[PDB]
Nucleic acid binder design. Structure first.
Lengths: 258, 148, 99, 173, 175
RNA sequence: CCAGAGGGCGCCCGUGAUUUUUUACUGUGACUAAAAAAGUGUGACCAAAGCAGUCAUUCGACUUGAAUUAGAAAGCAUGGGAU
RNA sequence: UCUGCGCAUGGCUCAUUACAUCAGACGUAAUCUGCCGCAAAAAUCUUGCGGUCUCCGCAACAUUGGAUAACUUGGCGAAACGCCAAGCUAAUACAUGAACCAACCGGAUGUUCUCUGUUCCGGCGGCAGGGCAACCUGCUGCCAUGGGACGUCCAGCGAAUGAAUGAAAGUAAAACCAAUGCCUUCACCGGCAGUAACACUCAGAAGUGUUGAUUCAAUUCAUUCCGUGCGAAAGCCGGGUUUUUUUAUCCGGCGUCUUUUGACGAACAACUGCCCUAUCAGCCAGCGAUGGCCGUGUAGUGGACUGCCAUGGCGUUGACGGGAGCGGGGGA
């Protein structure tokens, strides 16, 4: 049992300093893990800057003014992972968090339609009392599951005010993917060949726009859509392309003139 | 039926947990070419069962081929050193080591005490391939899959 | 007995403070069922049953779906079968009684 | 297949809805000679959805009808002979011809199956009167409370069916 | 302080390990339950999940099952006869899993009657069936040999099975 | 809703080696917390430091920035055929 | 002051400690897991009125029950984060307990009656004569494919034990009787064109779980569960109404019992690696040392432990013993 987290045992992706206290908030058990997530008070304070310090944060949160997934959240700390939607009425802002190139969390801004749309992977599929089929994901169960039954590793489309499930998408060649984990995340690609190694980690081989193809595992893959015109959701300014270190550097120089 | 005297030697009666031997008018088929009823189990990881195990006579609750022992993790090789004991064989391994300062190699052995189903009977100096398991004895943590 | 209200019939007590006028202390009543209480309680078990029935509704729709798929399957693999068989047959025997 | 609205429209509202539904977001309404339209969205899921949904349809006073693609088929259940069938009536043990008796002749019929408790009988066109008694009930007759009803299927076709069956058989053997 | 570890034991090399730690509640034994014949007594304890278990003491009553008839019915354990762990356990009339004991027989005898309209069923069920002669002699006489297949120190009940040809002959020949 | 007939591909299983073959080695990828180390950017008045901050005469713009690398032995995938 | 939650975290220190710890890489199908996330839940003869025979008739939104602190009264003790008798009263404490409303699906059955046996050769018998009830004889009823109605007992979640399920994937055309379906006929006449399943009510209301692998998930049947499991807290607060403040009027926010599985954790196992010493060469079984069999114990795996049986295990590629020492990221 551990109730304390510290600044040097916390991820780099939150971008907290070495200095300025020796403690960081430990998010609770929730829809997502401790080693990837962004906790509430970290978002509000250190990003959107509607809080300057700890007291400020809870003086927002505890009044029910912040809502991930349509449910108001009183708690100071509570994790928010990949592919969630944060809606704070008072401003008129809406976020859909995501990863972006350089492996680091990013924030999109979305309108009406996509403030009710989400996506969910499938981790496992199992059977419960009365022969009722069940799925399990990151965030939550939810029950049965047609849209038409099928299989693990596939990706659904979930609506949050009520279920209207548009279809789903599967893991098959020529489709499109965004990545998590593995120091390869914040990219986007196609799906070429998937190697299967029994009893052992399963290795995928991918591609992306204008070549520079690559590879990862298969539990770091999260499907997005059939094609890159077929996407249900919006994406950052970068389209999941890494470009070379030298290219980047050079460009930053040339444009700095102002 | 009447009872063996070469599969029985113990104070208690030797039987398989899995399946109903009391059987009777047999409801089938579950059974092995064709013969009295028997339990046999197809483990994966790209290994294929012995012919022998399926059609066997023997009663073992530690082999993965007729019991609920599961083979899961690490997968190893080695050769045989000594056939002693009852169902418990002894593996030797050999492999090298590298010291950065000298930039030269060195030889070392380990050894392991593994389980051998009565289905196999491998001789000293034969190769073998084995599998990871839950503790079946104080030392014993592996079980044979496949002989060479 | 019953129908007779005990809000009326509470004990009162009284306390002095010199030149600050008195106050009558008397107790709140607990384990008390009003109008509000009864309504609230009853309401719960209406919620309860409803939820159950929703489950059953879902289940029906699921089952129905599966069976419709299986139905389509049957039909499709009839068409295929029937066509193959009786077209090849048509050729065969018709031409041996036209011979 | 593209589905078929019927029992609307005439019509100014006809024309209006016709060019409103074209050409997206889905759908478009291809207006037709009389009171009906073709409604084009087609796909195997499309034919199922299109039934129970009623956007892209208007009425001017009319009651809507959603009909399969061709204008053919509904007249066959409606009319032209009857022919009638009766359900409570055992295979198992209670005999057939109680059936025939009940309707006072005009023959041909069978019981079906080992499943369950209908029989089927042709009393031709005049069965319109017979069923209008027994549908409005109709009780026991070594059976149970019942219902009778119709649609045409065969006759006429059953006789020509078994004819063309026997023909095939003789050739075959 | 009863412990379950390899710490107090020797190495495979005949050496001896040195500790640097006390002992935990993670490792934990508790003293054996010895479950005899007599009126039901129970001695509930609590485990490491907050889940009780029921240490049984003295059980005279049972539940026993045919294989092949696919039933189970009650009975009363009468005497203990054979145990293969020790002869100690026999003499004390204690009960452990895979112990061989004696039962009332009555409910089985009863039920096998039934193996109006009923009169047809008693033909159809009795057809395609025989009962062992081994089993027969026993069942008649009013006592049977049965085997407890439950662990009756951690559930506080005894349940069992019943012995047909193979198993049965292996036991009888001891006696 | 161009049929019959062989072809060809994608999944799944079963049967077949007169004995099927493998590692060290090396190429390219997988996997692997910070602090520290290496390193890109930035006039904290230089500096040791720190991840900041710079413009705009306005109720904000940078769709701000916080790159990148290394990490014995062992483990994992896939190429090479000399020693 | 009662109640609920937390104090097992954080802080501080390196004494013990070399198949020990620890780092890299793996495993738990061998396991437990409060708070938190998401999701479920159709069991139970209760209450009021009237009479009384114990048991009934008549109604329906459950007017539940018994205690104990603070406080007061007497106090005791040298002291004591020591204590006693009596009198008072609470609950989201503790203890009870909810019909109809409220469904789907299956079992076992009645000497229930009515479609019926179209149905005899055998069976079950029921009676008398000889009756020793062995049987022979004569007499007699019912049954020998079945289905409809009516009645009775059982059925939930979770847990134990025993059966069954938990797909298959290695030859090709006819006749035989027992059925039985469909054609077909006045016909229960004699042949195979059509043909998911199947006795109505439901003409598709699961013929189809995941994994490299399961004695797993889940399903069906038979027996069981007694405190050591299962309430709608018999709970709390708002807001709009209503007109009497003061409605069974509607709406919302909290809180809690039980079940299921994620990650916050815990426990267990070990593929590879690490100072000095041979003036440390044999070390391990009476008192478990290596393995085997049935058990016991534990959350679970195991010589973890009992009983019984074998004679193994390790080592000059440094065992065993001793000396120095918390391990790693890292610093000079």
């Amino acid at each position: 049992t551990k109730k304390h987290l510290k600044r040097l045992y916390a991820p780099k992706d939150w971008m907290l300093s070495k200095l300025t206290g020796v403690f960081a908030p430990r998010p609770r058990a929730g829809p997502h893990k401790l080693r990837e997530c962004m906790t509430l008070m970290i978002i509000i304070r250190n990003r959107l800057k509607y809080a300057l310090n700890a007291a400020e944060a809870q003086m927002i949160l505890r009044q029910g003014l912040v809502c991930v997934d349509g449910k108001p959240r009183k708690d100071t700390k509570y994790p928010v992972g990949f592919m969630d939607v944060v809606e704070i009425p008072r401003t008129g802002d809406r976020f859909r968090i995501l990863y972006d190139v350089k492996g680091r969390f990013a924030l999109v801004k979305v309108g009406e339609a996509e403030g009710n749309i989400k996506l969910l992977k499938v981790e496992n599929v199992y059977t419960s009392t009365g022969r009722i089929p069940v799925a399990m994901t990151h965030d939550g169960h939810r029950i049965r599951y047609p849209d038409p039954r099928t299989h693990r590793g596939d990706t659904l489309v979930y609506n949050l005010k009520e279920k209207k499930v548009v279809d789903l998408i599967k893991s098959s060649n020529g489709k499109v993917v965004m990545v998590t984990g593995g120091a390869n995340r914040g990219r986007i690609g196609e799906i070429m060949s998937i190697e299967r190694h029994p009893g052992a980690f399963d290795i995928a081989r991918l591609k992306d726009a204008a070549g520079h193809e690559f590879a990862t595992r298969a539990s770091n893959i999260f499907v997005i859509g059939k094609d890159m015109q077929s996407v249900p959701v919006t994406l950052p300014k970068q389209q999941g392309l890494r470009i070379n270190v030298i290219q980047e550097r050079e460009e930053k120089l040339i444009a700095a003139e102002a | 039926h009447s009872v063996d005297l070469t599969l029985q030697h113990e104070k208690a009666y030797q039987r398989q947990t899995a399946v109903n031997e009391n059987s009777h008018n047999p409801n089938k088929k579950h059974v092995n070419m064709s013969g009295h009823i028997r339990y046999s189990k197809k483990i994966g990881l790209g290994f294929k069962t012995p012919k022998s195990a399926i059609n066997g006579k023997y009663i073992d609750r530690k082999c993965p081929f007729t019991s609920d022992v599961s083979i899961r993790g690490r997968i190893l090789r080695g050769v045989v050193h000594s056939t002693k004991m009852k169902r418990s064989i002894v593996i030797r391994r050999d492999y090298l080591h590298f010291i950065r300062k000298y930039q030269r190699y060195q030889k070392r052995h380990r050894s392991l005490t593994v389980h051998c189903s009565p289905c196999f009977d491998p001789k000293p100096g034969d190769e073998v391939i084995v599998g990871q398991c839950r503790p079946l004895s104080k030392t014993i943590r592996y079980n044979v899959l496949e002989v060479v | 007995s019953r129908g007779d209200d005990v809000r009326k019939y509470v004990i009162r007590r009284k306390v002095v403070k010199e030149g600050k006028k008195d106050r009558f202390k008397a107790p709140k009543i607990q384990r008390l069922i009003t109008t509000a209480v009864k309504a609230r309680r009853a309401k719960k078990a209406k919620v309860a049953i409803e939820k159950v029935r929703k489950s059953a509704e879902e289940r029906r729709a699921y089952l129905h779906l599966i069976g419709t798929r299986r139905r389509a399957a049957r039909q499709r693999n009839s068409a295929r079968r029937h066509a193959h068989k009786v077209a090849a047959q048509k050729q065969a025997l018709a031409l041996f009684k036209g011979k | 297949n593209g589905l078929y609205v019927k029992n609307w429209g005439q019509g100014s509202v006809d024309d209006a809805r016709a060019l409103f539904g074209t050409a997206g977001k889905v759908v478009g309404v291809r207006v037709r000679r009389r009171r009906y339209a073709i409604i084009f969205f087609e796909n195997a899921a499309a034919v199922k959805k299109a039934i129970d949904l009623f956007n892209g349809k208007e009425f001017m006073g009319n009651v809507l009808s959603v009909v399969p693609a061709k204008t053919t088929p509904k007249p066959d259940p409606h009319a032209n002979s009857s022919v009638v069938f009766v359900s409570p009536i055992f295979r198992a043990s209670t005999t057939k011809k109680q059936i025939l008796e009940l309707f006072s002749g005009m023959k041909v019929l069978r019981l079906r199956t080992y499943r369950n408790n209908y029989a089927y009988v042709y009393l031709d066109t005049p069965a319109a009167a017979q069923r209008a008694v027994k549908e409005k009930n109709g009780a026991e007759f070594r059976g149970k409370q019942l219902r009778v009803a119709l649609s045409t299927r065969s006759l006429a076709k059953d006789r020509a069916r078994a004819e063309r069956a026997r023909l095939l058989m003789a050739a075959q053997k | 302080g009863i412990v379950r570890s390899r710490l107090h034991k020797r190495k495979i090399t005949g050496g001896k390990t040195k500790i640097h730690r006390k002992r935990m509640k993670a490792e934990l034994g508790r003293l054996p339950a010895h479950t005899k014949l007599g009126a039901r007594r129970v001695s509930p304890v609590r485990a490491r999940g907050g889940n009780f278990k029921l240490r049984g003491l003295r059980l005279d009553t049972g539940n026993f099952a045919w294989s092949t008839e696919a039933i189970a019915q009650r009975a009363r354990i009468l005497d203990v006869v054979y145990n293969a762990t020790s002869n100690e356990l026999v003499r004390t009339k204690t009960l452990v899993k895979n112990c061989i004991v004696v039962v009332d027989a009555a409910p089985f005898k009863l039920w096998y009657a039934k193996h109006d309209e009923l009169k047809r069923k008693w033909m159809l069920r009795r057809e395609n069936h025989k009962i062992e002669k081994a089993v027969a002699d026993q069942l008649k006489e009013g006592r049977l040999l049965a085997r407890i297949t439950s662990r009756p120190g951690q559930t506080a009940r005894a349940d069992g099975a019943l012995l047909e040809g193979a198993e049965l002959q292996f036991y009888l020949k001891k006696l």
